[PDB]
Structure 1
Amino acid sequence: EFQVLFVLTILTLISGTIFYSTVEGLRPIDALYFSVVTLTTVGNTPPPQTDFGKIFTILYIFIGIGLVFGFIHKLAVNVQLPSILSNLVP
């Protein structure tokens, strides 16, 4: 489960990194950053400048938001929770 969500999230972010670096001309790190804050809805960056970028972003959000949050709802629920919970046992 967690491993699958791990991989699925990775592929989605790889696609975004490749897309934004190419179409929006961003350095890879900036393309990855944009992909991450966009799918997590933080969105603390300017929007894409090209229409291709805007269209892809619309589809990217609808298809990737569900997956990203599913992974987050496990990275802290089935991994970080025990670490803290089980440790709260004297």
Structure 2
Amino acid sequence: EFQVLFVLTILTLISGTIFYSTVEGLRPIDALYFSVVTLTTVGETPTPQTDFGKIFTILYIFIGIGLVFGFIHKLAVNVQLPSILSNLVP
């Protein structure tokens, strides 16, 4: 469950990292940063400069946001909550 979402998220981020480092010519870490802030809806820096980068970002957002938030949702409810919930027991 959490494992599946984790793998799917990693694969999605790797895909984004490869795309932006290639098409937008970003250093890998910046490409990964862009992929992460975009899919978590935090932001979009550096904004794509090529039409290909803009088109891909549009599609990337619509397809990846759902996955990313599903992962964060389960990561917090099925992994972060129990660790604090149980740890709150005297």
TM range (shorter): over 0.9
List per-residue Cα deviations over 1:65-89 (Å, max 9, x = no partner): 0000000001111001010000111
* CA positional deviation for 1:20: 0.1
TM-score, reference length from structure 2? 0.97
List per-residue Cα deviations over 1:26-63 (Å, max 9, x = no partner): 00000000000000011152310000000000000000
Point out the more displaced range, 43-52 or 22-31: 43-52
Aligned residues: 90
Q: How much identity, in percent, do the aligned residues show?
A: 98
Question: Which secondary structure does the structure 2 equivalent of 1:79 belong to?
Answer: helix
Question: Which secondary structure does the structure 2 equivalent of 1:37 belong to?
Answer: helix
* Runs of 4+ off more than 3 Å: none
Which runs of 5 or more residues in structure 2 are unaligned? Answer: none
TM-score, reference length from structure 1? 0.97
Q: How is 1:37-76 mapped onto 2 (pairs within 5 angstroms)? A: 37-76=37-76
User: Which protein has the bigger helix share?
Assistant: 2
Which runs of 5 or more residues in structure 1 are unaligned? Answer: none
Q: CA RMSD in A?
A: 0.8
